[PDB]
Amino acid sequence: RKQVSDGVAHIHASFNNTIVTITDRQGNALGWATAGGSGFRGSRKSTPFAAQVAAERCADAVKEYGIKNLEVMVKGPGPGRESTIRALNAAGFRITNITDVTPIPHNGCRPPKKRR
Amino acid sequence: MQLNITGNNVEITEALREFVTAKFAKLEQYFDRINQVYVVLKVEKVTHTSDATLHVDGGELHASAEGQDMYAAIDGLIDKLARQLTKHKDKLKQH
Amino acid sequence: IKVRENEPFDVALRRFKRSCEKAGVLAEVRRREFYEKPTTERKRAKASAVKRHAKKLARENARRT
Amino acid sequence: PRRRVIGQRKILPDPKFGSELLAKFVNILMVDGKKSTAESIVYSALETLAQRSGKSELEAFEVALENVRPTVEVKSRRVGGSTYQVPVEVRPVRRNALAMRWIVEAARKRGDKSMALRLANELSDAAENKGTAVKKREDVHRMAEANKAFAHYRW
RNA sequence: CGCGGGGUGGAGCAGGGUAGCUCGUCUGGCUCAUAACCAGAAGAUCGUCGGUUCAAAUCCGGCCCCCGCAACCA
RNA sequence: UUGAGCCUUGAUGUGUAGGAUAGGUGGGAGGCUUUGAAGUGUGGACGCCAGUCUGCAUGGAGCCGACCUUGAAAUACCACC
RNA sequence: GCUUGAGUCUCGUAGAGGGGGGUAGAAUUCCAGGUGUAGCGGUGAAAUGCGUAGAGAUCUGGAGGAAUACCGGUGGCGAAGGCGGCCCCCUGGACGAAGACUGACGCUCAGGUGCGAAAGCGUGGGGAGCAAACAGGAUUAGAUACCCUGGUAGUCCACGCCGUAAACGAUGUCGACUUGGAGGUUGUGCCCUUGAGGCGUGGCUUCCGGAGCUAACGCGUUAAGUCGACCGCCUGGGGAGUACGGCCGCAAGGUUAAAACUCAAAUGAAUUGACGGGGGCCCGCACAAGCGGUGGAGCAUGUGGUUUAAUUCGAUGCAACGCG
Description:
It is classed as ribosome. This is part of a larger assembly, with chains A, B, C and D. By secondary structure, chain A is an alpha/beta fold. In chain A, 16% of the residues lie in helices and 30% in strands. In chain A, α2 (83-89) links the parallel β4 (69-75) and β5. Chain C is flat, with a radius of gyration of 20 Å. Chains in contact: A-C, A-D, B-D.
């Protein structure tokens, strides 16, 4: 329960799927929703509209916590990543920060081969 | 697949008719499903020439081959049609 | 990268900062070490960059219109 | 076509009512170019609409048409090596013409005895929204709203 | 040879006041077709009988099938 | 920290009909109240989002049962659960 | 003898030049814990795979390996191969300014000697990610491949071996000479450093072009121009950089290097076409948007085929088949 007020809304933004989860300031999660679980499967999982439906399905089931302000973390080069945040300020939230936290290696491990 | 064998100055025998259909059974399954075939055999004082008009789900394709003794002409005709059938097949796959 | 701007919400002011160097980098770490093609592509790049310098300087003679 | 935004020509209106919208409607079911046979069926089908609905005749026709006209239409779009059904919003001059074509193709099936009453039954049932003409509109919207994932426009 | 558990669309199964979902099978759309996905519909007297109250897939009896645990030292 | 069991209690059990979130059965028109009433400062639970409980009042001396519909009449009151 | 070639020294300057040791942050993976719940992952679509034994997402902590984002530059350095975080230690060369010094000490080399990407090999470690082989899922007529999910050698370290690459600038080394332009990088001189100013002068380097050269493409002061010194190499295509022999190597193999036979060509550059599942632009009932047909029915007619004594002959993809 705990009725927390300010939270963090992480957005995983892979190419094939967009995952949006909502946590608090401390970092432990509250609820999540994906674009593959919103009824979109296959070619339509990589659509910015499917990231919007994943957002409003995650904007519900956190009414139990009562969030009115949250930060936004985006991670990945996805087709969503900005249509998700438009489905949150329209859902009645105060977006204090929007932050890019995508992982960039300062040249570390070897990626796979280019597919032909 | 329906064969229609026809000869201009080459009256087709029974051994030649089954030689066409056994050869046209090859370029069958192995390359594409087809609707209807018209085969035309011609002899023009030197050239045993064999034509063929295939009808497929997309359009039509035609090939001709002149040869040596009317058996190598159809053997060159199928290799001309089989390459046009693989080019047409991958034109309709585009994966 | 980090926008904590006030007033009216419109990332608009976010994609100015973020579409700067946050997607060209992740799409090129996406796959293949290359180890020698960077070289090829790099060297093809500037042979076409001076193709824009040494032609557009020579294109200011006339325009036939 | 490639060129030629076509110079559009006009239609002469209906004699009995001052409308070209119903004159467009009589031209659709006019089979083999027989207009007197076409106009006799539609006049016998809308006087039947008045007694079976209570209202006046011509405005009972479009209230069966706003219940059957669509707002979005889905198309096949060729992109990449495949082709998916992208939805697009309909222009209004096509919107009514797509509606009254759906009425006639439902009127040639749904086989009752005469053509005048075959049209007269579902022009009522378009207003009560249980006929098979409205089930064409709702199953078009069922496919367009399922394909809301394809579009660079948000309206 | 008694204690338990389960009998529900073709199957797998959800579910004291109304029978649901995936597949398969019936189509629509699309595809070059099979497909894949999308969109609707049929699919049950809930194993069979009785009664327990207004009303039972639900609760209680007996029967049939099945899975278990034993009693298995004539 | 935590199951499970017992006791002391305190809540809760909207099909339909319908004035109503009525658990069952039985006794059943007397209790409630100024041990400072409805409205609400208020705070929650439940939430089958419709209604009930409790904390404190600045109000202050009121409310139901039989009489309306229901297979059933009222946590009106009490008892067994 | 001489100082102009070559070299030494004195001051500096730039540099991913090399070898050794330390260390930092980002990220991947794994492990542990918290929260949290039905999906994740993947693809053109899909499945294998993962997940109700709690994945994925998210947060904290830890372990370990490899690689150094941005800077990063037709930038720099090195004989070539090659060399990128940062710090220290040892160390090689290049270059410039002003002198001083030795006095042809030079150039190039068959053999020889050393260095030499990646893969591979041996012994001993290490092993995150990636990934031959291999395994499964797809695609397909088939798919032993491309794609997907996994995944072992290998990639990493130390010490040896191998001695090969389209090891390329497909251009040996050295020296001299012969119109220019735009730069990059790095020293330095003078004048008003009086201002990121102006004039010069070196080194390396990139591009474009003149003469000339070249079969043409192109090269063009860093030549493929004009010359000189020496070395390597070539002699039609296949056979064949193969056989045999020698040498070298643990092995893989390297190196040296034929002949029989066979062909009248092989080849280079450019030209015009044609074609491209290359690019741009445009048109046509070509598609789309619609209407009505065919294919299914009986019949009319033409053809193929069969039949017949003859079923006259010709027309055969589009452009023959209600055609002569």
